[PDB]
Design a protein around this ligand. Structure first.
Ligand SMILES: O=C(O)[C@@H]1Cc2c([nH]c3ccccc23)CN1
Ligand SMILES: O=C(O)[C@@H]1Cc2c([nH]c3ccccc23)CN1
Ligand SMILES: *[C@@H]1O[C@H](CO)[C@@H](O)[C@H](O)[C@H]1NC(C)=O
Ligand SMILES: *[C@@H]1O[C@H](CO)[C@@H](O)[C@H](O)[C@H]1NC(C)=O
Ligand SMILES: *[C@@H]1O[C@H](CO)[C@@H](O)[C@H](O)[C@H]1NC(C)=O
Ligand SMILES: *[C@@H]1O[C@H](CO)[C@@H](O)[C@H](O)[C@H]1NC(C)=O
Ligand SMILES: *[C@@H]1O[C@H](CO)[C@@H](O)[C@H](O)[C@H]1NC(C)=O
Ligand SMILES: *[C@@H]1O[C@H](CO)[C@@H](O)[C@H](O)[C@H]1NC(C)=O
Ligand SMILES: *[C@@H]1O[C@H](CO)[C@@H](O)[C@H](O)[C@H]1NC(C)=O
Ligand SMILES: *[C@@H]1O[C@H](CO)[C@@H](O)[C@H](O)[C@H]1NC(C)=O
Ligand SMILES: [Cl-]
Ligand SMILES: [Cl-]
Ligand SMILES: [Cl-]
Ligand SMILES: [Cl-]
Ligand SMILES: [Cl-]
Ligand SMILES: [Cl-]
Ligand SMILES: [Mg+2]
Ligand SMILES: [Mg+2]
Ligand SMILES: [Mg+2]
Lengths: 467, 487
């Protein structure tokens, strides 16, 4: 498969897909010469941290005598660059054996459009796929996506929560903006429905993307400028929102109340001090934080020399310290992760990282249920058991479907009939640090998804800065 | 990959067609290894589409002028209107390319006689074509769809190798808004197939409706595989709404279960605005639904002609058609027999009415024909390329003895030829072809008792905004029969 990867041999192999870069180099192909492989661009430190959470979980599991005693979990982890084409190249390598007719499960991907394309392929071979971040309602369809599960909740609930917040403040007038993809469009469509139900009037609705040109961006900015709406609901990833926000900042459009979907509510591409005059005071959703003891210390042990199995550690180092590995100064190999602020280690809560950790543990526990299976008490024909020495992916899928374990936070993890894992949301608000000058994500509330109308939303208004 | 239509040649075109309407829905409990899904419900019109591709290729091969050195072969698979079947097929189309991408030729035992697919014709449903395009685009294999009209496929960043001989739905959705504004209708309902055809068609409709101050009372989603509760919910929304006009963006197969239940409950007096995929669908235009579905107003693509195609169609035979492995089941389904009594092998295609041969106009069939000819002409442009005047680096030319798919794509992107109807065929920068629409209205035949598609207007996409619609109000029969409005 692909050149740059994180790989380690084992008895049972987990595939991994993570956005180590935010995108791909805009060399629009006129096809005058044979297309070359496209270059990934813009290092995603947070994504590398996500990838680390998978490697951490696997090492921790292998270090546990109790969990899967006979066996070692290995891995094969690739960079998607947030792009369907790269994700799919990687995925063709995961199914290489099956297609000729060995990867037993896949953790990923991030964007719902990437996970969809991956799922169409993995589902052919009944290889289970557990996404840590793809939240589109479209992936809940088990007729189309037969092998897909996720440790993040479905956006039906988040979109409803957005309508509930607006109704809570007795607002009645908003604008909407959505990424033109399988995350933004179904999220905002559900929002529209719930908003109409609550007599919230929507003054405009625009689409954006990472690749919107100057005219498209200009048009959206003009719609925003010509509207009396103050509250703008935005369902988008950071990369898809960034070009719009840059232009809004350029024109100094001040005083908007931004309501942020979870994909950009914590995005370092948007939460930048020099945008704060436009973007300050945004209110957004975040998933519930989880804890992973020892993960931060593991993170600080990365090294381009010592990390033999993780071929992304090299570029990570070069990007962090702005150097080149043996004029771009050469890296010493002795520099200090703690001296440079990036999202790699500058975080307070683990959210998506926790979902990654749970995705791996879901797979591991499903395998453990195979290991401990007693004849007659199994899930397959005639109460038969699968053989863990010769496990097939479809058996792991079966076990993932019936999985029920208690996680380190004391919570039961099970997947519903659609492969979804239910969850609540935290509500955060963008403040400026008086110490730091940086944007701080203050928790101001939470949303309890499965409570009765009018008992779901808990907000501490006193904590909100409207700028 | 078992049943297929296949024939060797120097240059191979892939094909994808919905020979069945769907698959046997059977939730797998995964107590034993999953088996492949069963395709169900023979699609005679789709088999005709597949025939138009084979016909075009035989015609081209019979032409001394067009591609003289070379023969075009083909490898054509049934999608059953499903992503998974389409993708199994597509993995065969890219088998060679894929081995190269992963260096798999060295690390496992791999053949040296895997024939290369140079272009693919298909698929039908936009949801299927999108998934196929993600894969074909990886290898820059050109894909020319004859029916996938979603605006999403116009995105060349995502779908690098996709083109089509059908217009995208942006104008069609606009036309629906124009018609409503024309009749001063308001508080309309919308229904869309929950896929990449229905959702973006209705989204564009919503935008245009808003621009014209048309209010929408409900918006529901449906599919072929909706369960009883889902269908019941949508029928209840329709029952509880004051809306008389309902805009429906869906294929026939995705609409059929909803319509059956609407008929079951005798919901009458609705004005249905039909997207092009179901405005002529034999699954919906059935006499016994006419009390619900009569008077539907919908869109139809421009017809084209293919001399000799009808006669080619009548030549099909389970014995003689060695290359077309769908001919067997076609025969059995047409004559209700087995190779249910045994088939003689001598029965007559003209004795049984199915969509195979019971048609007036070739529309999607013509798109299929043009898709194949688009590929052939792009190849011809390679054949006739003169050094310095070529499309590649330094005005260089491709070698037609060693053509690569990406070069065909390049040529398709700049293709400009004149078709048998005297029209220029070119694709815009998004891989799209422009087309007008006829507006049709569902009448009942006084002779036949069957549903007839009366032209009552047209939509000219070349005219200025607000001057594209023409309707002849006098020709509309409301609820299918009434010249008096309202009644
Ligand atoms: O499904 C999707 O496309 C989004 C992608 C996404 C989510 N959360 C994120 C955090 C960082 C980067 C990307 C994301 C939630 N679902
Ligand atoms: O893009 C899609 O999914 C639809 C599929 C489709 C169209 N027209 C048709 C006629 C007959 C059967 C199917 C179709 C237009 N685009
Ligand atoms: C917004 O206002 C500008 C300046 O008055 C006007 O000319 C333009 O047509 C408007 N643009 C949009 C997209 O509404
Ligand atoms: C935007 O407008 C403010 C006043 O609201 C003005 O000071 C300046 O032009 C802009 N703000 C900044 C931080 O540049
Ligand atoms: C999961 O297991 C716990 C502990 O036995 C049990 O209480 C809970 O009811 C189970 N949940 C499901 C959904 O099976
Ligand atoms: C959300 O939190 C509430 C309050 O702690 C709890 O009762 C509920 O079960 C949680 N829901 C989910 C889906 O985790
Ligand atoms: C429609 O009919 C009545 C409205 O009062 C009610 O019993 C039923 O639940 C309604 N259904 C829907 C989908 O609105
Ligand atoms: C259904 O209702 C209409 C009258 O509005 C008509 O088509 C038909 O006579 C009715 N049939 C039944 C069984 O109710
Ligand atoms: C195609 O060819 C004709 C003349 O043969 C030319 O005039 C026309 O502009 C061409 N079409 C396009 C879209 O370039
Ligand atoms: C569309 O309609 C008008 C004639 O009504 C004409 O200008 C144009 O040629 C038509 N285009 C096509 C592709 O038929
Ligand atoms: Cl990803
Ligand atoms: Cl799947
Ligand atoms: Cl981000
Ligand atoms: Cl098809
Ligand atoms: Cl493509
Ligand atoms: Cl149909
Ligand atoms: Mg262990
Ligand atoms: Mg809009
Ligand atoms: Mg020839």
């Amino acid at each position: 498969g692909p050149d740059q990867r994180a790989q380690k041999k084992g008895d049972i192999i987990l595939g991994g897909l993570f956005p180590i870069h935010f995108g791909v180099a805009a060399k629009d192909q006129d096809l005058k010469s044979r297309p070359e492989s496209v270059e990934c661009i813009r290092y995603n430190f947070r994504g590398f941290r996500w990838l680390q959470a998978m490697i951490f979980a696997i090492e921790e599991i292998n270090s546990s005598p109790a969990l899967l005693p006979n066996l070692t979990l290995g891995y094969r982890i690739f960079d998607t660059c947030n792009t369907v084409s790269k994700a799919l190249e990687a995925t063709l390598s995961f199914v290489a054996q099956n297609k000729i007719d060995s990867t037993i499960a896949v953790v990923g991907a991030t964007g719902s459009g990437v996970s969809t394309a991956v799922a169409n392929l993995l589902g052919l071979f009944y290889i289970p796929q557990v996404s840590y971040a793809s939240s589109s309602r479209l992936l809940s369809n088990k007729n189309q996506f037969k092998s897909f599960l996720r440790t993040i909740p479905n956006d039906e609930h988040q979109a409803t929560a957005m309508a509930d917040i607006i109704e809570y403040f007795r607002w009645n007038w908003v604008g909407t903006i959505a990424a033109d993809d399988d995350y933004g469009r179904p999220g905002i469509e559900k929002f529209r429905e719930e908003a109409e139900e609550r007599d919230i009037c929507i003054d405009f609705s625009e689409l954006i993307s990472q690749y919107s040109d100057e005219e498209e961006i200009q048009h959206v900015v003009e719609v925003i400028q010509n509207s009396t709406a103050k509250v703008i609901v935005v369902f988008s990833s950071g990369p898809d929102l960034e070009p719009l926000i840059k232009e809004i900042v350029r024109r100094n459009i001040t005083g908007k109340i931004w309501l942020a979907s979870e994909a950009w509510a914590s995005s370092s591409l948007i939460a930048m001090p020099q945008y704060f005059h436009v973007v300050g005071g945004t209110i957004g959703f975040a998933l519930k934080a989880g804890q992973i003891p020892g993960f931060r210390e593991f993170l600080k042990k990365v090294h381009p020399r010592k990390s033999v199995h993780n071929g992304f550690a090299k570029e990570f180092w070069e990007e962090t310290f702005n150097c080149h590995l043996q004029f771009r100064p050469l890296c010493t190999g002795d520099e200090n992760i703690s001296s440079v602020e990036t999202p790699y280690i500058d975080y307070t809560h683990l959210r998506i990282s926790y979902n990654v950790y749970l995705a791996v543990y879901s797979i591991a526990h499903a395998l453990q249920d195979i290991y401990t299976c007693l004849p007659g008490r199994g899930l397959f024909t005639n109460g038969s058991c699968a053989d863990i020495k010769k496990v097939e992916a479809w058996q792991v899928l079966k076990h993932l479907r019936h999985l029920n374990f208690t996680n380190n936070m004391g919570e039961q993890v099970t997947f519903d009939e659609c492969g979804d894992l239910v969850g609540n949301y935290s509500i955060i608000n963008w403040h400026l640090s008086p110490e730091d000058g940086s944007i701080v994500f203050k928790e101001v509330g939470y949303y309890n998804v499965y409570a009765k109308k009018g008992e779901r939303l808990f907000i501490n208004e006193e904590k909100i800065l409207w700028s």
